Amino acid sequence: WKYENLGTTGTKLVPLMMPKAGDNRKLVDFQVLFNNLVSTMLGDEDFGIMSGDVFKAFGADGLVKLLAVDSTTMTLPTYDPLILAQIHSARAVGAPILETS
Amino acid sequence: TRNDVAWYARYPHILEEATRLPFAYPIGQYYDTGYSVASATEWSKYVDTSLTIPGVMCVNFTPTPGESYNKNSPINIAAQNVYTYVRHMNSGHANYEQADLMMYLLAMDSLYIFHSYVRKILAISKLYTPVNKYFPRALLVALGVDPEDVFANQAQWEYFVNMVAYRAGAFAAPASMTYYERHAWMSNGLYVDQDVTRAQIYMFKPTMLWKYENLGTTGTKLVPLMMPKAGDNRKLVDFQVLFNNLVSTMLGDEDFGIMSGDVFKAFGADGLVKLLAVDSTTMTLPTYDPLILAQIHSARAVGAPILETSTLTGFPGRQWQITQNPDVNNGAIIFHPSFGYDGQDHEELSFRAMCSNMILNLPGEAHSAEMIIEATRLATMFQVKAVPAGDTSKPVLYLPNGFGTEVVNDYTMISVDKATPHDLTIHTFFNNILVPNAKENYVANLELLNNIIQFDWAPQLYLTYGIAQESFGPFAQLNDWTILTGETLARMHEVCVTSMFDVPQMG
């Protein structure tokens, strides 16, 4: 969901499609995807005010922590029956409808 | 089976008497070697008996907030971060936005660089060495001050610098924002190229500073205010009108007082930037700092700042401006200067030699990440050419691929003349030096080269010739070098602009 600020006529989270399997996308494609995702909220004043208000309301221990990655970071395959239970009863809804669709 | 005594130990007095030579010649002084043939005076300029050794290379810099094209810039994200830190520490409704606070926070940096500059002018003037005759007058000439005005009017100079520290110390700026600490580290300090007593000295002087220039409802525009160059014999009245032009819009102003008091409430009094006081006993000594030398060695000069009065034929509206406007780019702080200017509305053909990929050179073989990223700070690489307007353009401009918290405009070197009366000589140059086709400037360019290689970590030179139509590459000695492309330097620039403008944790 990409933010797409509109002003006095409100706010509209828009779809930003991710690359699908078989697309051989390089780092430049993920870079322009990240830059398209943050173009309206990176150095913006309203997002900073809302972020600082969330940072004052919930403490620094109460915030969502992003994991850092070095050259030794590995995720191992784990066994989780809750994941498997919701995959087993998953029903696919289809493709997202876009404005160009 | 008895080793007999050698000749040098059988006659040690002969060896010690033949080899008693007077070393440690004072620098700041012309030396004639004399003739070994002495019939060679018939060969007038074909015999060189002169020996001039330079002492000062001043790096002339412009303080920058980094490159900025939109609100996704690191200066705008830093503005957001510091504004939500300050606003969530101050009870009440603010009247300023995030961009007003960051423009205040850059104007405070230009004030602190001015204070460090005039305090450097003061603290240099008390330096004396018998074996270095460049102290203190060549350092004062390289900073653009008349040296006799500082000695004749010493108490007035001390009053002026103490009043600058009092009037700029009334404003608050965060101490744990390393931009101020780095700019103070550069502007306060003499740096030897080698840890010896007769060493060459590096300095840092601002080429220009940022003047606030409030505009009202149409935003905020930091404008250039040029500093005096080396060879200008500027007195205390000139530095006084420079200080008065720098503070005319923010000294007794209400908005700057409100922003200063909000920074003073957000960050404690221990968390503010402290300006150093100067008495009549204040002295700065030349120190050995390999990080300074590493970033001087990989410095690349970007050229002169473009001003509003500067005439450029095919480039209108390219003056250097940290701007802010709610009409343009959604109220983001905007700064993207073009490079390759020197005055003199024509193409400086030597900047084509700055279109290669740079060489980052270090000593030793083990390089930490901190040393590698500190050595790239004054490095700036061009990326594309700026597009002119009018199909008739005399200069050639370049857009960078990002830059650090300061760019290098120039280097100024101070040596002694080989002609009588052997006064100070002032040479200004970029990394790129054009050698046109005339008989005068070949030996002059060779003298500039031999002067530059006396400096241990001098910036790497690029030399082009007129008749050759050819540039020569990096004129420097390499030890452990790598080739930097513009993208690696852009990533290091973005990391270092983010690290300089970083605020602590609370909200």
Curated annotation (Swiss-Prot), chain A:
Coiled coil: none annotated. The 7 kDa polypeptide is acetylated. It comes from the Viruses. Picobirnavirus particles are capable of disrupting biological membranes in vitro. The gene is Segment-1. This is Capsid protein precursor. The capsid protein self-assembles to form an icosahedral capsid with a T=2 symmetry made of 120 subunits. Homodimer. The lineage of its organism: Viruses, Riboviria, Orthornavirae, Pisuviricota, Duplopiviricetes.
